[PDB]
Design a protein around this ligand. Structure first.
Ligand SMILES: CN(C)c1ccc(O)c2c1C[C@H]1C[C@H]3[C@H](N(C)C)C(O)=C(C(N)=O)C(=O)[C@@]3(O)C(O)=C1C2=O
Ligand SMILES: CN(C)c1ccc(O)c2c1C[C@H]1C[C@H]3[C@H](N(C)C)C(O)=C(C(N)=O)C(=O)[C@@]3(O)C(O)=C1C2=O
Ligand SMILES: [Cl-]
Ligand SMILES: [Cl-]
Ligand SMILES: [Cl-]
Ligand SMILES: [Cl-]
Ligand SMILES: [Cl-]
Ligand SMILES: [Cl-]
Ligand SMILES: [Cl-]
Ligand SMILES: [Cl-]
Ligand SMILES: [Cl-]
Ligand SMILES: [Cl-]
Ligand SMILES: [Cl-]
Ligand SMILES: [Cl-]
Ligand SMILES: [Mg+2]
Ligand SMILES: [Mg+2]
Lengths: 207, 207
């Protein structure tokens, strides 16, 4: 099949959804594409370059809320931003493991820059705007990794069904796995944003 | 060398610090221990059982603040808890990648149970206590993964040194990598806790 950037990325994401990150290799990618490894090598040097590119593309394709709406509050933008980040990461198997250790790509510079200018225009210093952005990303990444990687681990070996857990831990785990972890996440996200709001409004006051 | 649980775990953590999670194998563990693979297999069935055990042991050894102090506020306990969780995860290379997708171990039941009882005795429902605990873990895990995995990625290929970044993104990344990410983390952690505090005190009031 065809080996332009787009087709290589499409085949790569298919294979990622078939086999997960740890068994995504240039060997199996070559196989999926019906080509010899030294053909693929012309197009994709290594698994790292491949992972770097999927990270960027999963967002370009599926992270629809990168930009604030005209007039949107910074709280609403961080919420809508986080929800969209979470969506994009969950869309492919081990997606958050793919995102891990990427930095914004040149094709995301203007997007990430705008996001920081927007914060700073709402009364954040660069530094608190940065911390808010970073906290939202790290929170959202952990929440999606815990969920994806809890799941991957269960494929490999089960858990004790209850007949062994102490009572609170027993009902806590029933609750946290009764949706995908979406309510733990949406609740944590409100706590985080209100925390940034309390910090920002305080200004020089001891808070 | 000796193959009791303790010695296998010690050798495993050494190898983890030498080679990272992705090149930690039962082959190289057998080599490190100076034994044949079918000898190791008696002791350790697979990489999963091995990862499950290192996850538990890295905490037992190095997560000193699992328990609140008598009289300690829930805010102070979540802070001291998170800081200690972060420490334990950073102590070994790809440590957070090791923790990912573990659930509390039987030898951590009484610890995690106590943590939930403590929250609920401070006025959290099980559910908000749970969300607070989960948010603190997911935040702390993302923060440590972003840092560890940003680092692992740099071994594999560098970044653009500045002569290409737009201005805010340029100075943001200088700031966020001028310590290990410890100030982004400690700031995010205060925002999260104050957010849980605002939620809890509100009770039935629209907040
Ligand atoms: C400059 N800024 C503080 C940093 C620092 C370190 C980082 O590792 C990153 C950023 C920007 C953030 C912005 C976030 C943004 N959001 C908070 C989720 C975001 O929506 C995007 C995006 N491309 O739309 C990211 O690049 C992003 O996911 C991302 O991957 C980032 C990222 O990796
Ligand atoms: C029951 N509780 C809500 C859950 C649910 C899902 C989970 O995946 C987990 C917990 C408890 C938390 C407690 C946290 C605690 N802390 C908030 C960091 C903690 O200090 C410990 C500990 N063993 O001391 C954990 O087990 C812990 O790191 C952990 O790994 C957990 C964990 O994995
Ligand atoms: Cl074709
Ligand atoms: Cl082609
Ligand atoms: Cl193309
Ligand atoms: Cl490869
Ligand atoms: Cl293969
Ligand atoms: Cl986890
Ligand atoms: Cl010996
Ligand atoms: Cl022995
Ligand atoms: Cl032992
Ligand atoms: Cl193995
Ligand atoms: Cl090997
Ligand atoms: Cl990251
Ligand atoms: Mg990122
Ligand atoms: Mg855990």
């Amino acid at each position: 099949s065809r080996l332009n950037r787009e087709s290589v990325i499409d085949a790569a994401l298919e294979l990622l959804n078939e086999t997960g990150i740890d068994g995504l290799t240039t060997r199996k990618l070559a196989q999926k594409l019906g080509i010899e490894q030294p053909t693929l090598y012309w197009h994709v040097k290594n698994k790292r370059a491949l992972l770097d590119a999927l990270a960027v593309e999963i967002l370009a394709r599926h992270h629809d809320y990168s930009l604030p709406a005209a007039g949107e509050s910074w709280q609403s933008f961080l919420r809508n931003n986080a929800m969209s980040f979470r969506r994009a990461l969950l869309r492919y198997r081990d997606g958050a493991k793919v995102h891990l250790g990427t930095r914004p790509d040149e094709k995301q510079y203007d997007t990430v820059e705008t996001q920081l200018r927007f914060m700073t225009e709402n009364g954040f210093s660069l530094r608190d705007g940065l911390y808010a952005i970073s906290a939202v990303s790290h929170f959202t990444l952990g929440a999606v990794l815990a969920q994806q990687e809890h799941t991957a681990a269960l494929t490999d070996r089960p858990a004790a069904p209850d007949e062994n857990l102490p009572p609170l831990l027993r009902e806590a785990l029933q609750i946290m796995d009764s949706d995908d972890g979406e309510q733990a996440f949406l609740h944590g996200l409100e706590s985080l944003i209100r925390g940034f709001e309390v910090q920002l409004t305080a200004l020089l006051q001891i808070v």
